[PDB]
Amino acid sequence: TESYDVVVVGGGPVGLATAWQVAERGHRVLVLERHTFFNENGGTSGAERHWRLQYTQEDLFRLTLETLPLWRALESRCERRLIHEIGSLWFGDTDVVTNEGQISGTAAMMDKLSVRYEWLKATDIERRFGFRGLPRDYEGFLQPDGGTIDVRGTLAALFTLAQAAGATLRAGETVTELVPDADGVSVTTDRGTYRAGKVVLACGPYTNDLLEPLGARLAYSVYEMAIAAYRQATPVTEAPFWFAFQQPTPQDTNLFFGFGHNPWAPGEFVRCGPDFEVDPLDHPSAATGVADRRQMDRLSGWLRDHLPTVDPDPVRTSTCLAVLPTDPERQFFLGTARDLMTHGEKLVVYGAGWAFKFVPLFGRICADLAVEDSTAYDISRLAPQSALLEHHHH
Numbered sequence: 001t002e003s004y005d006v007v008v009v010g011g012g013p014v015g016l017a018t019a020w021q022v023a024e025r026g027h028r029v030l031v032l033e034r035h036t037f038f039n040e041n042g043g044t045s046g047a048e049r050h051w052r053l054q055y056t057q058e059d060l061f062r063l064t065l066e067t068l069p070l071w072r073a074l075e076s077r078c079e080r081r082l083i084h085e086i087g088s089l090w091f092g093d094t095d096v097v098t099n100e101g102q103i104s105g106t107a108a109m110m111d112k113l114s115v116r117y118e119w120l121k122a123t124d125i126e127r128r129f130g131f132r133g134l135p136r137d138y139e140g141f142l143q144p145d146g147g148t149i150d151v152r153g154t155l156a157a158l159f160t161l162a163q164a165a166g167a168t169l170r171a172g173e174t175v176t177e178l179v180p181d182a183d184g185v186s187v188t189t190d191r192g193t194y195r196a197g198k199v200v201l202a203c204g205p206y207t208n209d210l211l212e213p214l215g216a217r218l219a220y221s222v223y224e225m226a227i228a229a230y231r232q233a234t235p236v237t238e239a240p241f242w243f244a245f246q247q248p249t250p251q252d253t254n255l256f257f258g259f260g261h262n263p264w265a266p267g268e269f270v271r272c273g274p275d276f277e278v279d280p281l282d283h284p285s286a287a288t289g290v291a292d293r294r295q296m297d298r299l300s301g302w303l304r305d306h307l308p309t310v311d312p313d314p315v316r317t318s319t320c321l322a323v324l325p326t327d328p329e330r331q332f333f334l335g336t337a338r339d340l341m342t343h344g345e346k347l348v349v350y351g352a353g354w355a356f357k358f359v360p361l362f363g364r365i366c367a368d369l370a371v372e373d374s375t376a377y378d379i380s381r382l383a384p385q386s387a388l389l390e391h392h393h394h
């Protein structure tokens with residue numbers, strides 16, 4: 001049984017960022033990853049992730065401002081620009097309400113927070129970005145500060161920095177049991193056992209598998225989402241991230257999005273996807289890894305009709321797992337398990353969120369809680385929510 005100050009369960013971006021921060025602070029940290037580092041079987045896949053500035057949720061705007069300096073520090077340390085301002089384009093029917101929100105409502109929130117944007121008409125959208133055949137009443141905005149994030153560059157940086165700082169990184173090892181006590185946590189994996197001062201759970205959609213035996217269950221839902229990669233057919237002029245807000249059809253939500261071009265890449269491929277209603281998985285093992293045929297056909301057909309800048313026959317289709325609070329009013333689960341079980345403060349939990357954009361911040365917060373039990377950042381609205389009735393003594 002090896003002993004560490006902190007054991008991180010999960011070697012995705014949040015786990016690696018936490019380990020880098022813990023090790024740089026001079027504590028002994030071990031990261032246990034069930035598959036391989038850089039795997040694309042959890043919530044981290046593809047080459048890119050979006051970082052918009054526009055939100056109707058005040059807390060997301062605040063987190064965005066607090067994370068930016070942390071991205072800059074990371075970029076400096078690894079000698080790589082990781083965030084690229086390519087723009088965030090939201091267009092279509094400006095009043096339809098979707099899981100992404102509503103154009104008009106969001107534009108009012110930008111007006112209020114003093115976030116700049118340009119309002120565009122269908123003809124401007126087709127001219128500037130290459131879309132074709134849009135209904136002439138479609139409108140929307142371009143928030144120029146919207147960015148795209150180099151996912152592979154970020155993972156490489158975090159892995160290398162964590163390793164250089166002394167973190168012990170082990171792959172192909174699955175954590176199967178956690179038992180906190182007053183003096184630390186006992187960790188069992190399919191390869192051995194460990195003793196930790198505290199454990200950070202950054203295991204994507206698997207958090208409940210380790211909390212269940214301890215009498216806790218968090219209120220999050222897991223979704224397998226389809227994504228398709230397409231070859232760029234015509235050279236880009238402006239290729240921002242885009243989301244098409246439309247009225248639903250009787251069979252689907254009729255929503256589609258594209259991540260935009262990847263500046264660090266040769267400009268050969270881009271990725272897009274449908275944003276259709278998807279029922280939650282009962283457990284992550286239910287994921288198949290095969291993108292839903294009908295959704296891929298709908299997306300490819302829409303791109304054939306409306307965005308001829310890309311060859312609409314996908315080069316590759318795949319899936320990614322989203323892990324989100326079941327309550328749409330909540331954005332993230334980041335905190336300890338202090339209110340969920342005895343000695344719960346010894347388990348630091350990153351349990352749900354649409355969060356690649358906050359990876360440097362979340363890693364710092366998890367490191368703070370792992371070695372101090374407190375962070376200077378406000379995480380009051382991110383408290384992990386129990387899926388069970390409260391019957392325990394507090």
Ligand SMILES: *Cc1cc2c(cc1C)nc1c(=O)[nH]c(=O)nc-1n2C[C@H](O)[C@H](O)[C@H](O)COP(=O)(O)OP(=O)(O)OC[C@H]1O[C@@H](n2cnc3c(N)ncnc32)[C@H](O)[C@@H]1O
Nearest residue numbers: 010012013014034042043044050175203204320355356357
């Ligand atoms: C799927 C998805 C997510 C997404 C997105 C689009 C799609 C299709 N677009 C985003 C965007 O534009 N902007 C953004 O900020 N986020 C966006 N997301 C979400 C983002 O990708 C996720 O928030 C992020 O990937 C989460 O990272 P995290 O590090 O939390 O999790 P992970 O990569 O799933 O890694 C967890 C690791 O844990 C390992 N694991 C699991 N169980 C165990 C056990 N028992 N023992 C050891 N290791 C374990 C996994 O193997 C994994 O590597």
Ligand SMILES: O=C(O)c1ccccn1
Nearest residue numbers: 050052100243257275354
């Ligand atoms: O606004 C976002 O963050 C978003 C939406 C759909 C797909 C990817 N990113």
